């Protein structure tokens, strides 16, 4: 029973916790499926909870983060209005998952107030940020990383901070967050480079900029190595989360080896 076995059951456990919740509140089969297709969103919680020693607390915190991440994901499909899904169901399942998560995270936290504290602290940064991103599209790598630092980095960093606040002792809150923010930027690029052909995306899309020459391949490569670096350092701060080392390499090499050549 290695680490990959833990990741997979963590992922199955989160998905089921989420689909059960979507269904119990009125979600149509289309919506239930759509949520179970959110693979990485259901898996990331497991990485954020890697510093949590007690396995029972870890599974609980893991699925509570999953409910809220899926929730924000649905609110997003709601603002893009392109999934063909029912807007009432989307809006409602979204509110429900979110409320259940709050309730689950608060009952796991050392101090209940810290959940709202984390969620409020950079709510303007995340929300004004998401707005600016869709308002004015990026045209160079600088503006891209700037935008991505909010809907990707800040977005996962909050779940990192929550993971630490609800994971008991032996949690270097600052590092978990550093890890999350760097890991997120990496995933955002991947997503961007996948979605160019899977979603038909262009405006502000990193792949589009690369293909148009507005962004140089080696810069993208640098950013990727920097992120890898920031992530390795974060999972090395005491107590440490050596489990995440191979994970950081997996997602980074995948963008370098599989995704990038597609655009260069």
Ligand X SMILES: CC(C)=CCC/C(C)=C/COP(=O)(O)OP(=O)(O)O
Nearer to a copy of itself (CB atom), residue 130 or residue 252: 130
Nearer to a copy of itself (CB atom), residue 14 or residue 130: 130
Instruction: Work out whether 131 is an interface residue with a copy of itself (CB under 8 A).
Output: yes
Alpha carbon distance 161, 116 (integer Å): 11
Alpha carbon distance 153, 52 (integer Å): 21
Q: Residues 47 to 106: which contact a copy of itself by CB under 8 A?
A: 72, 75-76, 78-81, 87-96, 99-100, 102-103, 106
Asked whether 151 and 122 are in contact (CB, 8 A), the reply is: no
Alpha helices, DSSP H only, in the chain?
Answer: 3-24, 29-36, 39-48, 55-80, 87-106, 113-121, 123-135, 141-148, 155-166, 173-198, 206-211, 217-234, 244-254
Nearer to ligand X (CB atom), residue 54 or residue 254: 254
Q: Residues 65 to 104: which contact ligand X by CB under 6 A?
A: 72-73, 75-76, 80, 91-92, 95
- Least separation in angstroms between residue 38's CB and ligand X is 9
Instruction: Work out whether 112 is an interface residue with a copy of itself (CB under 8 A).
Output: yes
Alpha carbon distance 228, 253 (integer Å): 9
Residue whose structure tokens are 């050392």:
110
N- to C-terminal Cα distance for the chain?
Answer: 39
Instruction: Work out whether 126 is an interface residue with ligand X (CB under 6 A).
Output: yes
Task: Pick what 89 binds: ligand X, a copy of itself, none; C-beta below 5 to 8 Å, kind-dependent.
Answer: a copy of itself
Length of the chain: 264
- Least separation in angstroms between residue 88's CB and ligand X is 9
Task: Pick what 155 binds: a copy of itself, ligand X, none; C-beta below 5 to 8 Å, kind-dependent.
Answer: ligand X
Nearer to a copy of itself (CB atom), residue 126 or residue 207: 126
Nearer to a copy of itself (CB atom), residue 88 or residue 250: 88
Instruction: Work out whether 151 is an interface residue with ligand X (CB under 6 A).
Output: yes
Alpha carbon distance 74, 199 (integer Å): 17
CA distances from 213 to 68, 186, 208, 264 (A): 37, 21, 9, 10
Task: Pick what 73 binds: ligand X, a copy of itself, none; C-beta below 5 to 8 Å, kind-dependent.
Answer: ligand X
- Least separation in angstroms between residue 115's CB and a copy of itself is 8
Closest CA to 158 of 96, 116, 189: 116
User: For residue 5, how many other CB atoms are within 10 A of its CB?
Assistant: 9
Residue whose structure tokens are 């649905």:
74
- Least separation in angstroms between residue 83's CB and ligand X is 9
Contacting positions for ligand X (CB under 6 A): 72-73, 75-76, 80, 91-92, 95, 126-127, 130, 151, 155, 188, 191, 195
Contacting positions for a copy of itself (CB under 8 A): 24-27, 72, 75-76, 78-81, 87-96, 99-100, 102-103, 106-107, 111-113, 116-117, 119-120, 123-124, 126-128, 130-132, 134-135
């Amino acid at each position: 029973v290695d680490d990959d076995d833990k990741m997979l059951a963590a992922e199955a456990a989160n998905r089921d916790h989420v689909t059960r919740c979507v269904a119990q509140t009125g979600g149509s089969p289309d919506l239930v499926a759509h949520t179970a297709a959110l693979r990485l969103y259901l898996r990331v919680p497991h990485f954020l909870t890697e510093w949590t020693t007690d396995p029972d607390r870890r599974a609980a915190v893991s699925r509570a983060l999953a409910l809220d991440i899926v929730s924000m994901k649905l609110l997003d499909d709601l603002m893009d209005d392109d999934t063909g899904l029912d807007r009432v169901e989307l809006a409602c399942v979204c509110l429900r998952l979110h409320l259940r998560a709050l309730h689950e995270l608060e009952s796991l936290a050392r101090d209940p107030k810290a959940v709202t504290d984390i969620l409020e602290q950079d709510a303007v940064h995340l929300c004004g940020g998401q707005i600016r991103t869709k308002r004015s599209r990026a045209t160079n790598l600088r503006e891209w990383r700037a935008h991505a630092s909010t809907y990707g980095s800040t977005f996962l960093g909050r779940y990192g901070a929550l993971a630490a606040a609800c994971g008991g002792e032996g949690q270097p809150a600052d590092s978990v967050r550093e890890f999350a923010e760097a890991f997120a930027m990496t995933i955002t690029m991947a997503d961007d480079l996948t979605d160019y052909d899977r979603n038909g995306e262009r405006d502000g899309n990193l792949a589009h900029l690369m293909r148009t020459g507005a962004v140089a391949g080696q810069d993208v490569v640098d950013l990727l190595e920097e992120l890898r670096g920031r992530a390795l350092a974060a999972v090395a701060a005491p107590p440490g989360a050596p489990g995440l080392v191979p994970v950081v390499h997996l997602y980074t090499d995948d963008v370098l080896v599989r995704l990038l050549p597609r655009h260069l």
